[PDB]
């Protein structure tokens, strides 16, 4: 074979960073094979908004965008077009007319530590709602009070980020879930990627 699509790398990455700064992976010019994707673990949530999973092979895409992050179980429902919620409006907002597949599978067996995995963080205080497909990594003292924060925290001045504490004893609904959102873009230029 000439090429392969790095689908085995977007998954099986052993680390998904966080969702406040979601990893953005751009894939192009490769042979698209979804056998490994379907051969990975059974998926808690696999919803495709644009194309049927089989007809994905019939349609050729120049640009494929992959976004990988870890969120709680109940926050998966927030990652959907037209959803209102903390994660949806402050961490990662899909567009209203999003065309892509949202793939989620449990990561409690690997990414949960008894002491508490505080590496993964999410944002819970932002000045306004995020525009679709945006990544905001700026972390300065939130100014909730009408008095100037003067660069410090405490009274009416908080930090924009709060981490999840993931432990294996947690029940479903707060266990860490690995979500890899695939985004497809079509623009008027020669694609030259098919099979």
């Amino acid at each position: 074979i000439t090429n392969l699509c790095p689908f085995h790398e977007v998954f099986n990455a052993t680390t998904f960073a966080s969702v406040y700064a979601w990893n953005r992976k751009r894939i192009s010019n490769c042979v698209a094979d979804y056998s490994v994707i379907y051969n990975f673990a059974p998926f808690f949530a696999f919803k495709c908004y644009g194309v049927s999973p089989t007809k994905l092979n019939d349609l050729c895409f120049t640009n494929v965008y992959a976004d990988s992050f870890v969120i709680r179980g109940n926050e998966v429902s927030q990652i959907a077009p037209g959803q209102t919620g903390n994660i949806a409006d402050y961490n990662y907002k899909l567009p209203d007319d999003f065309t892509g597949c949202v793939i989620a599978w449990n990561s409690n067996k690997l990414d949960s530590k008894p002491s508490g995995n505080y590496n993964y963080r999410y944002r819970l205080l932002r000045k306004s709602k995020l525009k679709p497909f945006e990544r905001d990594i700026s972390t300065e003292i939130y100014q909730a009070g009408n008095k100037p924060c003067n660069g410090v925290a405490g009274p009416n001045c908080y930090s924009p980020l709060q981490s999840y504490g993931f432990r294996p004893t947690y029940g479903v609904g707060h266990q860490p879930y690995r979500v890899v959102v695939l985004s497809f873009e079509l623009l008027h230029a020669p694609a030259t990627v098919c099979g």
Binding site: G116, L124, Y142, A144, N156, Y158, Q162, T169, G171, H174
Partner: protein
């Protein structure tokens, strides 16, 4: 930019941080209870200290937002919970001496032991030996000796400490916005800001008074019957017109009359329903007991249990080298962790206890969506009330026959039902006048109505007038009888049990009407009724977000606690009591006393 907007973000941050800190405190507690070691003790102490420090810091932070500027009626409740001022508003030395008094009282009650005079051969503690003697022994002299010995051992030591305690708690309440510590405790039922559903602190007194005035006839007939049976037992120590003596009630205090069932059972030929031998002969164990309870809670409409619950919960005692507390308890560790700690054995009592604990866990699951400060029962009584309603529903002969523990060829008669109702009466009705009397006396002592030189005199006069119980040996002001009870010694609210007793029967009446039941209320099974489960879930999902008046409206259609459910429950036993006591003087006179 406003008070409300500022308060919202602070509440969100506090809820998120408190979730994790409460989870580590609860996990430390669970580890210590399951497996007691020095490392676990240190971990639990550290987690508790961290949680207390966080609560104090956030409470001091939250006082900035005035409660007149908040108009959501939910943020207001969360801020009231935060600003409840659990951290002492009094001085440092005053807080230290209050803690000293509480610790001394708890230590005295826990380590209280009684020996023979000038004889160290035997020294009995309260729970192991003294409670056993009170429960089983039939000797009038021994019972009087044990009662007087406990009172002389504990009350003489605890009287001045309790006087200092009442003074200090009144000072603390005056330092806060409440009047007395009785007002502080009554504030748990206070609901303000919601027109058409409000509850006032002063309304609880009137509601409890009216409820007891309604209960009075049934309790009077029960007292007459028990007095007649105890006259048959002890020939001359009980007067046909006199009040029942205290030490003969069954337990050290008279809170429960269940120990009198063996002496005062109406019909002894037909035994009460027992399923232990049947469970052994059908080869049942604790795991399948909990599985059957899960099936019942599914059938009523409540959700199934968690795989994590099944994996982490220890429903059997490990034994051997491992030592753990065996008091049944349902743990809501938080963030989806629900567990039960119960040394379950193959008994009908353990089956009912498992149903009670799974009712607890189902309530905890129901209020899981609400914020941390609201993740509780609407008041102090609904949580145990929900446990108890499932306990009564799962004990019916119909349910036992359906599950198969009893032989389906069996049929029930009048004597069995009367005996079961009388046992439940001694368990339930008996504790109501005692709870009412104790709470009234404690409220009056807090309010200062009862002077120090007349504390015990008024206590015994009110007990004689209300509960119809008189002390064997008269006690002057030196003794402090109420301090003997664990709740009074450790300063726990005690009207919770009265409220729960009314609430469980109201819930049962509502759910039985929902489940399309025809017949007397005691033989009510809600096994396969899906409508009753949803009608209960309408309250279970709320938590503390809505007032308890609105929750009670959602369940039973009434905004106030009612005792007619209890009266309708005990109607057949009341008919039996009317038949039995037709020749007996119902009531009691205050003049008679054991001492002459």
């Amino acid at each position: 930019s406003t008070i409300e907007e500022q308060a919202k973000t602070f509440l969100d941050k506090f809820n998120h941080e408190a979730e994790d800190l409460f989870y580590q405190s609860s996990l430390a507690s669970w580890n210590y209870n399951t497996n007691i070691t020095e490392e676990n003790v240190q971990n639990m102490n550290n987690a508790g200290d961290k949680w207390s420090a966080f609560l104090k810091e956030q409470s001091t932070l939250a006082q900035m937002y005035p409660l007149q500027e908040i108009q959501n009626l939910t943020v207001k409740l969360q801020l009231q919970a935060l600003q409840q001022n659990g951290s002492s508003v009094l001085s440092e030395d005053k807080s230290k001496r209050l803690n000293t008094i509480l610790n001394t009282m708890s230590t005295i009650y826990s380590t209280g032991k009684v020996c023979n005079p000038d004889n160290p051969q035997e020294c009995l503690l309260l729970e192991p030996g003294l409670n056993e003697i009170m429960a089983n022994s039939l000797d009038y002299n021994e019972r009087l000796w044990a009662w007087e010995s406990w009172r002389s051992e504990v009350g003489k030591q605890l009287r001045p400490l309790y006087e200092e305690y009442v003074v200090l708690k009144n000072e603390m309440a005056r330092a806060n916005h409440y009047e007395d510590y009785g007002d502080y405790w009554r504030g748990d039922y206070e609901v303000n800001g919601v027109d058409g559903y409000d509850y006032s602190r002063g309304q609880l007194i009137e509601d409890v008074e009216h409820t007891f005035e309604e209960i009075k006839p049934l309790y009077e007939h029960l007292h007459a019957y028990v007095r007649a049976k105890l006259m048959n037992a002890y020939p001359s120590y009980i007067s046909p017109i006199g009040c029942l003596p205290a030490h003969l009630l069954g337990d050290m205090w008279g809170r429960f009359w269940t120990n009198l069932y063996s002496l005062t059972v109406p019909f002894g030929q037909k035994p009460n329903i027992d399923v232990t031998d049947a469970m052994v002969d059908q080869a049942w164990d604790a795991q399948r007991i909990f599985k059957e309870a899960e099936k019942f809670f599914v059938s009523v409409g409540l959700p199934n249990m968690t795989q994590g619950f099944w994996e982490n919960s220890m429903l059997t005692d490990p034994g051997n080298v491992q030592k753990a507390v065996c008091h049944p308890t349902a743990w809501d560790l938080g963030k989806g962790d629900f567990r039960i700690l119960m040394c379950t054995k193959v008994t009908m009592d353990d089956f009912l206890t498992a149903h009670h604990e799974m009712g607890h866990i189902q309530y905890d699951m129901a209020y899981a969506a609400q914020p941390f400060l609201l993740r509780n029962g609407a008041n102090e009584g609904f949580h145990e009330a929900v446990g108890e309603i499932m306990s009564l529903s799962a004990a019916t002969p119909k349910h036992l026959k359906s599950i198969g523990l009893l032989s389906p060829d069996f049929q029930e008669d009048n004597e069995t039902e009367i005996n079961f109702l009388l046992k439940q009466a001694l368990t339930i009705v008996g504790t109501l006048p005692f709870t009412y009397m104790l709470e009234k006396w404690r409220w009056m002592v807090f309010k200062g109505e009862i002077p120090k030189d007349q504390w015990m005199k008024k206590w015994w006069e009110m007990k004689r007038e209300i509960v119809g119980v008189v002390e064997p040996v008269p006690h002057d002001e030196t003794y402090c009888d109420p301090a003997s009870l664990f709740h009074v010694s450790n300063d726990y609210s005690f009207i919770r049990y009265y409220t729960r007793t009314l609430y469980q029967f109201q819930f049962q009446e509502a759910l039985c009407q929902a489940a399309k039941h025809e017949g007397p209320l005691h033989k009510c099974d809600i096994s396969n009724s899906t409508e009753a489960g949803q009608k209960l879930f309408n309250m279970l999902r709320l938590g503390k977000s809505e007032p308890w008046t609105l929750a009670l409206e959602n369940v039973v259609g009434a905004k106030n606690m009612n005792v007619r459910p209890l009266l309708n429950y005990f109607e057949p036993l009341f008919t039996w009591l009317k038949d039995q006591n037709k020749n007996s003087f119902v009531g009691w006179s205050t003049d008679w006393s054991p001492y002459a």
